[PDB]
Structure 1
Amino acid sequence: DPTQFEERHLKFLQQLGKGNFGSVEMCRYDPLQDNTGEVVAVKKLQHSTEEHLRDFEREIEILKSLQHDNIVKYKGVCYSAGRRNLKLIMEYLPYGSLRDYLQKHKERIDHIKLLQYTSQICKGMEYLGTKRYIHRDLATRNILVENENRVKIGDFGLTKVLPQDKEYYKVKEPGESPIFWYAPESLTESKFSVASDVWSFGVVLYELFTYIEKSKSPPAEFMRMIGNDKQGQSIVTHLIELLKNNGRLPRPDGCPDEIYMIMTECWNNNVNQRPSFRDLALRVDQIRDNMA
């Protein structure tokens, strides 16, 4: 009954985000037509092909199986008659993405606060790992802000389930890929694992401590390091060679030494040497404790 949402009762309120394959809208589920209904986040496909609907149904099952304080809450699904188009209903987190929230308030969010968000992201990621899911798209644009004290991981659109017998998932024909957040083995061999999500987490830590200063973004900085003249496939070729030669994002201005050390450990070329999310949450909570 409650996880079953009638499409005719969903009132469009505003556009929240546009993705690779779909979009997120803020809607009011109002089966009384008196504007007293619940506000929800609705994800739908812009191009609802057979393949996209199959991947979207997988994302829906992934989200429904996760129950953690730092993972967006699944609410339900809408089904259309005939071709069976799907809408994913979720809780609406009113402060928007962490990227936009941090870009808006900048240094008004102190290091203690950025570390509280860091800890929350590690715990969400650690929990994800227990289900053998690989996020593949961890970035501040995919983290949502519930309120000043809580962030949650969103956009499971690229998420993969590890096979029973392997610790990595190989993507045979990649679609749009966030290469500036990718581990070297993800760029070279299209292999994704808990360890490549740890690499991404290091880029998220970098994002947080740059306060989303446009000129300092991972695409602007990697582009500067490989040369702005690089285009299309040549960018991937030069990024791989850069990472292999220990080219890395710089320390963000005013970033504490203990935090920058964590980023650099996440960015190890040796997959086995990268820290675990269980250890990261422990280390971050110790740093917050020392800071307090």
Structure 2
Amino acid sequence: FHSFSFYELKNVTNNFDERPISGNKMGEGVVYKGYVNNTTVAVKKLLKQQFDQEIKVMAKCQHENLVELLGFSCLVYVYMPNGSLLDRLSCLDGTPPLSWHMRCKIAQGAANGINFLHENHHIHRDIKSANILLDEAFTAKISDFGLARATVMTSRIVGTTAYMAPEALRGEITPKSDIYSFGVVLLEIITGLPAVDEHREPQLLLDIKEEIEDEEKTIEDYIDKKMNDADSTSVEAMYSVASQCLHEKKNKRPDIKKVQQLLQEMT
């Protein structure tokens, strides 16, 4: 890695411009746009124990479906031209909707990323569409390794509530919890709906699974209307994977290698 100095990064961010574009701030520590020679970068100005793991994971783990850390002193990353899956799903700033075909590539790539992490004996602990970033070609790249962990329990429960497995909300640290979170992500990819919306009924997206099972509604009734290329067969095939992931009994969920397999078979 490139061992940076806090003054260089200030000028690249132009005195750390905490403002939109109409500045440098892209969103949120905080993340601002920048440049190093020609290389566009996202700098994360940040807890100390979290920074140690972020560098540990980024040094051990290198994959095309994971983000790349360039510098540290303030973690520095290759700017992602298409932001997060969350923002692209909600068409933030007027970006056009993702087609079914693009969404499949995203799901597939994100599973590959998780498989690489599970292969290298690591648990993400915070899989969510905001942590799935997209490059110039919309390749999915898993991000945020600060709370990552190399069955085990903790008294300090952390993550994003709407994405968390039941046993994860009880304290458990299992790689099977990441699988549950990925199933919520697959539901957002199908529906284009955020995992949680206070001004919505149901507020929680993982509740639609129950409505479908109790035949109150169909998966067809929940498919994102902001697409023209989705076919019932492959949509039902992604929902089936999502359903399997979202089993309340952690040992009844598929492993990431099988999730990865079911996504390939779909295309």
Tell me the TM-score normalised to structure 1 length. 0.72
Instruction: Map residues 12-51 of structure 1 onto 2, 5 A cutoff.
Output: 12=13, 14-18=24-28, 22-29=29-36, 36-45=37-46
Q: Which amino acid is 1:118 matched to?
A: A
Summarize deviations over 1:169-217 as a string: whole Å, max 9, x none. 4221235x31111111112x211211110000000000111123xxxx3
Tell whether 2:195 aligns with 1:218. Answer: yes
The separation in 2 between residues aligned to 1:248 and 1:206, in whole angstroms, is 13
1:137-156 → structure 2 map (5 Å cutoff): 137-156=126-145
**For residue 185 of structure 1, what is the aligned residue in structure 2?**
167
Give the residue type in structure 1 aligned to 2:60. S
Q: Which moved more, 1:201-210 or 1:99-108?
A: 99-108
1:91 matched to 2:78: yes
SS of match in other structure, 1:42: strand
RMSD across aligned positions (CA): 2.7
Residue 109 of structure 1 deviates from its aligned partner by: 2.4
State which of 36, 56, 61 in structure 1 corresponds to 2:56: 61
Change (3 A) 1:111 1:284: same
Counterpart AA for 2:252? Q
Matched, 1:270 2:249: yes
Per the alignment, in what secondary structure is the counterpart of residue 286 of structure 1? Answer: helix
Q: Is the 8 A contact 1:101 1:145 kept in 2?
A: no
Unaligned runs of 5+ in 2: 15-23, 225-231
Question: Is contact 2:153–2:171 with CA below 8 Å preserved after alignment?
Answer: yes
Once the 2 structures are TM-superposed, how far is the Cα of residue 248 of structure 1 from its aligned partner?
6.9
User: How far has the Cα of 1:124 moved from its partner?
Assistant: 0.1
Once the two structures are TM-superposed, the CA of residue 107 in structure 1 deviates from its matched residue by 8.1
**8 Å Cα contact 1:160-1:169 kept in structure 2:** no
Q: Give the conservation status (yes or no) of the 8 Å contact 2:110–2:142.
A: yes
SS in 1 for 2:130: helix
Structure 1: gaps spanning 5 or more residues: 30-35, 46-51, 79-86, 162-167, 229-238
1:135 aligns with 2:124: yes
Cα distance in 1 for partners of 2:123, 2:56 equals 14
Contact 2:3–2:71, Cα closer than 8 Å, also in 1: yes
Given the alignment, which residue of 107, 116, 135 partners 1:118?
107
Quick one: structure 1 residues 221 and 258, their matched pair in 2 at CA, closer, same or farther if it must change by over 3 Å?
Answer: farther
Matched, 1:172 2:151: no
Aligned partner of residue 100 in structure 1, secondary structure: helix
- Residue by residue over 1:229-283, the C-alpha shift from the partner in whole angstroms, topping out at 9 and shown as x without a partner, is xxxxxxxxxx9xx98xx84787333662212111111011221111111111111
* CA distance, structure 2, for counterparts of residue 248 and residue 53 of structure 1: 43
Question: Which has the larger Rg?
Answer: 1
Tell me the distance in 1 between the aligned counterparts of 2:134 and 2:188: 15
From the superposition, tell whether residues 281 and 221 of structure 1 become closer, same or farther in structure 2 (CA, over 3 Å). farther
Q: Deviations over 1:37-61 (max 9, x none)?
A: 532221121xxxxxx1122222221
How many residues align structurally? 236
Amino acid at match of 1:101: R
Question: For residue 262 of structure 1, what is the amino acid of its counterpart?
Answer: V
SS of aligned partner of 2:63: coil
Greater fraction helix: 1
Higher strand proportion (structure 1 or 2): 1
Tell me how far apart the structure 2 counterparts of residues 23 and 101 of structure 1 sit (CA, whole Å).
Answer: 20
* Contact residue 16 and residue 25 of structure 1 kept, 8 A: yes
* Distance in 1 between residues matched to 2:120 and 2:90, nearest whole Å: 32
